[PDB]
Amino acid sequence: THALLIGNPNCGKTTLFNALTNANQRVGNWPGVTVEKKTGEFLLGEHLIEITDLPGVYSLVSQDEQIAAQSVIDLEYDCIINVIDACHLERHLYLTSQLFELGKPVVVALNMMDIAEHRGISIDTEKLESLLGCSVIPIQAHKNIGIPALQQSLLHCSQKIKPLKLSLSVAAQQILNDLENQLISKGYKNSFAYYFSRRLAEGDTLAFTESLLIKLQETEQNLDVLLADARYQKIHEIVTLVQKK
Description:
Elements: E1 2-7, H1 13-21, E2 25-29, E3 36-44, E4 47-53, H2 63-74, E5 79-85, H3 89-99, E6 106-111, H4 113-118, E7 122-123, H5 125-132, E8 136-138, H6 147-155, H7 170-186, H8 190-202, H9 208-218, H10 223-242, E9 243-244
Parallel strand pairs: 1-4, 1-5, 5-6, 6-8
Antiparallel strand pairs: 2-3, 3-4, 7-9
């Protein structure tokens, strides 16, 4: 069973990678580019788990930032391990909310709990999980704390997640729902149409994609700005419920 590992840069993503895969890991190039790909695997009982590390990115919309953007559509994977840094929850969940729009299983690895605590940051894990609708597994990858539970949660990471409920203008919701339907008629599968619409809305470039993009500009609405805000408000609201100081 195949797990992509995703997060923002500098979140201990590599350390978690090392913690999970140990010496059973290797480096090559991503296909036809210079960026190095790291892959590895671990046994979890009789179960094999393969893991592909993605280069960190704030947002799915810069050669590295590009690889991650296309791998979550290009690759065949069964679930995502979204690594979050507890100390920068609000930023790090921007990516998370975007990932939930893939309709693929996600488990959150809530890393740096020790640094979080040292900085007087307290996170209600049960509440974050209740809000986000996926396992949220507190860890300290650098110290191997939490790894076994995150491993355990991998075996039961087969349910897909709901996009977060975002509040957009009626004008704006209208445009995203036209865009989604245009895509379905085109022949796209539902999961992908929902996801690909949001990316377009944000102004993602990655012949048919360039026609739609000018069409979104001609509505003179700045969808990108609007969608970023609605994503931000829901996320700010989740942070204010779960995190103090």
